[PDB]
Symmetry: C2
Subunit: 77 residues, 2 copies
């Protein structure tokens, strides 16, 4: 029943990473996390984000495959 809408919703969220406002929000959240570290770790954390934010998102989307996610909660085979 819910199998197809679950997969569409996971895909919707993952494609919405292309939206400008979503990109701004993700980068802001990453910068906020780095901001609570002391020097020199804050700067090192900012450098890490600048290099690895794309791969971080790519890996998260990879792991959150719609079929895997939606079968894990039991609405899809």
């Amino acid at each position: 029943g819910f199998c197809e809408v679950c997969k569409k919703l996971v895909l919707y969220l993952e494609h919405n990473l292309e939206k400008n406002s979503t990109k701004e929000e993700i980068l802001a959240a990453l910068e906020k996390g780095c901001s609570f570290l002391p020097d020199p770790y804050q700067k090192q954390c900012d450098d890490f984000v600048a290099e690895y934010e794309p791969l971080l998102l790519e890996i998260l989307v990879e792991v959150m495959d719609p079929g895997f996610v939606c079968s894990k909660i039991g609405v899809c085979p």
Copy 2:
């Protein structure tokens, strides 16, 4: 290199998913997805979200493990 700050940042993100503001943002994002559907499909989508969104959030929290993420992107050992 970046291994130590990666784990600190992913720990932050893991706990940030548990904030009420973040939980509300994720729920609202899913509900916005449903809003693009015409009737009766929007209601079916809303029903799914109402029943299952906390289980979806749990899966996202589980993925956001510092050791897992930081080794998957290649900055930390396993």
